[PDB]
Amino acid sequence: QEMGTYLRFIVSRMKEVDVPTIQEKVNEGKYRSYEEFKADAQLLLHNTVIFYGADSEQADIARMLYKDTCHELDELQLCKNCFYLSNARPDNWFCYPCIPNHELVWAKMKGFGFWPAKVMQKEDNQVDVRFFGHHHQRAWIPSENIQDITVNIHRLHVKRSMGWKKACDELELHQRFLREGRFWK
Ligand SMILES: [Zn+2]
């Protein structure tokens, strides 16, 4: 059931065996698992490969479509609450807490000063973050370019643009929602 909510988002974005079939399979609960859904997306790609050739521009386009679809499934697995909110986008959607809570950090992308962000996952040498601010940019950040959220940021390289200020405002609203236990709807 909840599966239908998420897959609906994915198919809807897919627009932009065939897609109408997949859509109605989603709506009629025909997929027992995400893996069944992904297999139909794969079959869709393989049919394009068959029809036009493995080296065709049609294949290239279809490969990226499948890749984009699989990316959505990866993101869903990373955190279903983030995926829901990032798709439904109520007001202040990025401010609502998740469980477990995302680690918050200051992160510097190459070329930029520090911006606040949520940690999505990590490995020893780099961290996958989603930034606060209007564009909610996603990026891998080298571990040496991360600072604890509790650091005095006035000390460090930042550019206090309006976008940045808005990101800090969004960060503070998020920390408040955490303290309030204000969970989405
Ligand atoms: Zn989350």
Task: Give residue 4 CA to ligand 1 midpoint distance, Å.
Answer: 19
9 Rama sector, left if φ>0, alpha if ψ -120 to 50, beta otherwise: alpha
Task: Give residue 48 CA to ligand 1 midpoint distance, Å.
Answer: 35
Q: How far is CA 38 from the centre of its chain?
A: 18
| Other beta carbons less than 10 A from residue 65's beta carbon | 17
> Which residues carry a binding-site annotation for Zn(2+)?
79, 82, 98, 102
| Other beta carbons less than 10 A from residue 134's beta carbon | 11
Take residue 1 and report the two structure tokens written for it: 């059931």
Q: Which residues of 161-180 are buried (b: 16+ CB within 10 A; e: fewer)?
A: eeebeebbebbebbeebbee
Angle ∠(118,121,122) on CA atoms, nearest 5: 110
146 Rama sector, left if φ>0, alpha if ψ -120 to 50, beta otherwise: beta
> Do the beta carbons of residue 89 and residue 96 sit within 8 Å?
no
- Segment (H or E) for 12: helix 2-14
Task: Give residue 119 CA to ligand 1 midpoint distance, Å.
Answer: 9
Task: Give residue 122 CA to ligand 1 midpoint distance, Å.
Answer: 14
Strand ordering across the sheet containing 126-131: 138-142, 126-131, 114-123, 104-108, 146-148
> Which residues carry a binding-site annotation?
79, 82, 98, 102
> Do the beta carbons of residue 134 and residue 163 sit within 8 Å?
yes
Task: Give residue 130 CA to ligand 1 midpoint distance, Å.
Answer: 10
> Do the beta carbons of residue 118 and residue 130 sit within 8 Å?
yes
Domains and CATH numbers, the chain: 1-89 (1.20.920.10), 96-185 (2.30.30.140)
